[PDB]
Symmetry: D2
Subunit: 298 residues, 4 copies
C-alpha cells in the first residue's frame, strides 16, 4: 500500500488538501511517515552530519588509545577488531538545554546543535498542529497537552554505530513502540535500516536523502483515544549506509496529564506522563503492596 513519503511545503499550496490527507492516513494506518521539504536547510543537516561524525571520530581515536593501554595491563594485545564502535549521548533542549554543558563538544558544534534543536522543535509543533487540524482539535491543543507546567521534554539522542555483523543476529530481537509523544529522526546516507511492523510483517522505511522520519508515541495514542496508534519498530545498522542517527523526542512534560481528548471520544486512561515512565523504569514495584495489586489484576 506504499509507505507515506510526504513533502511538507505542499501544505502551503494548492496540494495542501491532498498532503494533509497523506498525514491523516499515515497517522491512522502507519504510525510513521517520512518527510522531505520539511523546512530544515539541507545546509544545516549536512553541517550537523559533518560535525557529529567529526566528534565521533575523535572519540574513537581516543577510545582505541585507551583500549591498547587497558588491554596491555592484562598482558593482552589490543587489535582494531577489539574496538567498540558504538557511541551515543543525549542533548536536552527543553525545558532546559544542557547543550552548553555537555562534555567534550566544540562550541561551534554546540551552536549548530542549539540551532538544529530549535528548528526541530518548530517542525515538531507544526506537525502537532497539522495533526490537530486533521483530528478536529483546536490549534496548539497537543502542544498545550504536552506543556504540563514547565513545558515539554525535548531532547536529542545522538548515536554512531558500525553495521550489524550479520543480519541473522537480529533474529529474536524484541521490537517496541515509543512511549513518548512525537519522534523526529534524522539520519545520514539514504538507507537507515529502520523498519516498522505493518500487519504482522516488517516494512522498510524508504531511503530518502535529507529526510526526517516522523513517528508517533504512546502518548498521542492515548490523547487520540486510539485514532492514531503507536507502531512497533526497530533500526538495524545497514552494511549499506546509515551509521549516524539523531533521534529527537518531543514528549509531554514530566507532570503533564494525559487523557483522550474529550472531543475525540473503549476509552483510554488518564494519567501523569511521569507515572507512565516510572511504570517503564520499573520503579513502580519495589514496594510489596503494588506487586500484590498487580498480581491480583492478572
Amino acid at each position: 500500500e506504499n509507505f507515506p513519503i510526504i513533502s511538507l511545503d505542499k501544505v502551503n499550496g494548492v496540494e495542501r488538501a491532498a498532503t494533509m490527507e497523506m498525514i491523516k492516513d499515515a497517522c491512522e494506518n502507519w504510525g510513521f511517515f517520512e518527510l522531505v521539504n520539511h523546512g530544515i536547510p539541507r545546509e544545516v543537516m549536512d553541517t550537523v552530519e559533518k560535525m557529529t561524525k567529526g566528534h565521533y571520530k575523535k572519540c574513537m581515536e581516543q577510545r582505541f588509545k585507551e583500549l591498547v593501554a587497558s588491554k596491555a595491563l592484562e598482558g593482552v594485545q589490543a587489535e582494531v577488531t577489539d574496538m567498540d564502535w558504538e557511541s551515543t549521548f543525549f542533548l536536552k533542549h527543553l525545558p532546559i538545554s544542557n547543550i552548553s554543558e555537555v562534555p567534550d563538544l566544540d562550541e561551534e558544534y554546540r551552536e549548530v546543535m542549539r540551532d538544529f534543536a530549535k528548528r526541530l522543535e518548530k517542525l515538531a509543533e507544526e506537525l502537532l498542529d497539522l495533526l490537530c487540524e486533521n483530528l478536529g482539535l483546536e490549534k496548539g491543543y497537543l502542544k498545550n497537552a504536552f506543556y504540563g507546567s514547565k513545558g515539554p521534554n525535548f531532547g536529542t539522542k545522538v548515536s554512531n554505530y558500525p553495521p550489524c555483523p550479520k543480519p541473522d543476529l537480529i533474529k529474536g530481537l524484541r521490537a517496541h513502540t515509543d512511549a513518548g509523544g512525537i519522534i523526529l529522526l534524522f539520519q545520514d546516507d539514504k538507507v537507515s535500516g529502520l523498519q516498522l511492523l505493518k500487519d504482522g510483517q516488517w516494512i522498510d522505511v524508504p531511503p530518502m536523502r535529507h529526510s526526517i522520519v516522523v513517528n508517533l508515541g504512546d502518548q498521542l495514542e492515548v490523547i487520540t483515544n486510539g485514532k492514531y496508534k503507536s507502531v512497533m519498530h526497530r533500526v538495524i545498522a545497514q552494511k549499506d549506509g546509515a551509521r549516524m542517527s539523531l533521534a529527537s523526542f518531543y514528549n509531554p512534560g514530566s507532570d503533564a496529564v494525559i487523557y483522550p481528548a474529550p472531543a475525540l471520544v473503549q476509552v483510554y486512561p488518564k494519567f501523569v506522563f511521569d507515572d507512565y515512565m516510572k511504570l517503564y523504569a520499573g520503579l513502580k514495584f519495589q514496594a510489596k503492596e503494588p506487586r500484590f495489586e498487580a498480581m491480583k489484576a492478572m
Copy 2:
C-alpha cells in the same frame, strides 16, 4: 515488646509448647526472629566464616593490584583509600548447585559451602514445617507449595563490606520486604546492623553469637492470606562488627503457583512466582498494552 530470640532445640523438649508459640508470635507480629541452637555446628559456622573472609582478602589484594595499575594508566596515584571494599557473589544450591562452577574458589571452600547449603536447606524445611503446624496445615504443605516442578530456588548471597562511613548517610535510604519465601541470614561477630520496621519505628536485631536470623518474604504472606506479613528491613554496616553476611534465600520454584492456602481463608492473589519476579525486574511493561492497562488501573 522485645525481639523474639528463639532456641530451636527446645521444640524437642517439654518447652516445645512455649517455643512453638514464640514462632507463632514472631510470625504474626514481627516477620522476623533470631535463632540459636538451630542445629548448625558452631564448628561449621566458624569454618564457613574463616574461609569466606580468606577468599575475600585474596580478592581484595588482587583488587588493589589492579587498582594501582588502572589508576597509573590515567597518570593517577592509587591510594588504599581509593579501594572498593565491597564484594558479593551468589551460590545456587537448588534446584541446581553451581558451587562446583563458581569462579576462583578453593575446593575445600566449595565443599564447606556445599555442606552448609545442605544444613541450611534442612533448617529451612524444618522451620517451614513448624510454621505449617502453627498454621494448621499439613506437614510439608509449604515445602510442597514451593516445589513447582523442578523444585524450590535455594541460593546464598555472600557479601563482604566495610562499615558505612557515617550513619547519617543512611538517611533517605529506602527500605523493603523480601519478595521470596523464607530467608536465613548468617553473619559474623555479634552486631549485624540489621533493623526491621515495627509500628513505624526502627528496631535493631539483638546481637547474638552464632545465630541465624530468619525472616519471611511476600510469598508466605500470600500463602497465609495475610496471617504472616513480610516486614520492611535494612542492614547497615556497623563500625561495630558484622562485615560478612551470608543471606540464603529459600524461594518458590520458578513455575510454582502461589495462592492463599484454601484452609487459611480480603483474599490474596494466585499466581506463578515467576510473574511476581518479572513484575519486579520491570520486564512486564516493555510492551505498550500492559502499560495502558497499568495506567487504567490507577
Copy 3:
C-alpha cells in the same frame, strides 16, 4: 614481491626444497606467511567456525536483552543500533587448559576447541622445527627454548566483531608487533582485513580459504639475533567478510630465558620472558628507583 602463501604438505615431497625456502624468505623478509594444506582438517576448521559463531549469537541475544533492560532504567529506549557487537574471550591450553572451566560454553564446543588447541600446538611445533632447520639449529631447539620449567604458554583469543563503520576511522591507529613467540591465526571467510607493514607501506594478507596466517613475535627476533624480525601489523574489520578470528599465541614459558642462539651470533639481550611482559604491562616503574634509571638512560 608477493606475499608468501605456502602449502605445508609440500615439505613431505620433492618440492620440500623450494617450500622450505619460501619459509626462510618469509621469515627474514616478511615476518608473516599464509598457510594452506597445513594439516588441520577443513572439517575441524568449519566445525570450530560454526560453533564459535553460535556461542556468539547466543551471547548477543542475551546482550540485547540486558541492553533493553539497562537502558529502560534510565528512561531510555534501547535500539539495535545501540548494540555492542564486539565479544572476545581467551582459552588457555598450555601449560594448563582452563577450557573445562571457561564460562557459558557447550561441552561439545569445549571438546572441539580442546582438539583444535591440540592440532594447532602440533602445527606450531612443526613450524618451529622447520625454522630451526632453516636456521641451522638442532630440532626442538626453539620448542626447548620456550619450555622454561612448566612449559610454554599456548592460548587462543576468540573474537567476534562487526565491521569498522568507516575505513577513515582507522587513521592514526597505532600498529605494533607481537611480543610473544609464534602466532597462528585462523579466520572465517576469505578476507581478513589483516595488514602488515613492509618497507613503510601497508600490505594486505591475501584472502585464502581455510588458511592459517602465521607470524613471528619479538621473542623469535631475540633468539635469532635479528635474522628474523617481528613485523608491525593491524587487523581491520572488513565490511567484506572476516568477522570471526581465533588468534592462538605460542609464547615462551613465564620463566623461560630468552637470548640469541649462540650459534646464531649488534647482539640481542638475554632475559626472562616474564620481565619482558612486565616491561609491557608497565609494572616495572611503579617504583622510584627504576624510573630514575630509565630517565638516566635516555
Copy 4:
C-alpha cells in the same frame, strides 16, 4: 626522633631561624612535615569540608537509588551493605581550571574550591621558596623550574571513603612515592591513617586539627640531586575518623625540564617531566625497540 609538626607563621617572627630548620630537617630526613598556622582560614577549611561532604552524601543517595534499580534487574535485592561508599574526582586549577566545568557541583561549592585552590597555590609557592632558601637557591628557582612554558600542573584530588573493613587487609599493600613536585594534603577530623616509611618502619602522621600535610615528590629529589628524597607512604582509612581527603598536587609543567640544580651538585638525570609520567603510564614500551633496549639494560 619525632615527626616534624610545624607552625608556618613563625617564619615571620624571631623563631623563624628554628622553624626554617625544622623544614630543612623534615626535607632531608622525613620527606614529610605537618603544617599548622599555614595561613588558610580555619573558616575556609571548614566550609570546604562541609560542602565536600554534602556533595558526597548527595552522590551516595543517588548511588543507592541506582544500585537498587540495577540489582532488581537481575532479580537481586540491593541492601545498604552492597553500597560502594568510595567516591573520588579531580579538579584542575593550573594551568587551566576546569572547576567551572566539573559535573554536578554547586556554584557556591565551585567558588569555595576556586578560592581554596588559590590559597593552596600560594602556600605551595611559599613553601617552595622556603625550600630554595634552605637549599641555597635563588627565590622562585623551583617555581621557575616547574613553569615549563604554560606553567605548572596544579590540581586537587577529592576523595570520600568508608573505613578499611579490617586492618589486616592492608597487608601486602604496596607503598609508593609521589612522582610529582610538592603535595599538600587536607583532611577532616584529626586522624588521617596516613603513614610514612622511615628506616624500614611505618610511622603515623600525628593527628592535628586543621593541618595541611606536606610531602615531596620525585621531581624535587631530582632537582636537589638527592638532598631531599621522596618518601614511601600509604593512607589507610581509619575507623577512627578521617573519611575525606583533598590531595592537591603541584607538579612541574608537562614540558618542564627537570635536572639537579647545577649549584646543588652520583648525579641525577635531566629530562622532560612528561617523559617521566609516560614511563609511569607504561606508554613507553608499546614499541618493540624500547623493550629490547630495556631488557638490554638489565
